[PDB]
Amino acid sequence: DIVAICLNVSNTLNLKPRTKVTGAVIPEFGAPAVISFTTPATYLDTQHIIELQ
């Protein structure tokens, strides 16, 4: 299976450029998935969807 966890971060975390984001999805049992990315140096208006990790 593949499934997408959807999070709206607009007011909660302030993801401007050059910003490190760290985290995990932790299940009831078993090993966590590790989220780890740094947002790009430049965001362009021609490319509103970005691949982060």
Binding site: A31, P32, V34, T38
Partner: protein, 53 residues
């Protein structure tokens, strides 16, 4: 009499292997982050630049 003890130490064997596994799993996680980061960063460095006209 003998039977009783066998069971008890078996429990310990399980837990100790579990604890060791945790180290290996976790550590692999910790490295995954930095491994990727290093490659991406290094590529962007060698590829990018500006040229005087």
């Amino acid at each position: 009499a003998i039977g009783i003890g066998t069971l008890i130490i078996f429990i310990a064997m399980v837990l100790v292997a579990a604890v060791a596994a945790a180290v290996l799993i976790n550590t692999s996680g910790f490295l995954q982050q930095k491994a990727m980061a290093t490659g991406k960063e290094s590529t962007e460095q060698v590829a990018s630049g500006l040229l005087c006209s």
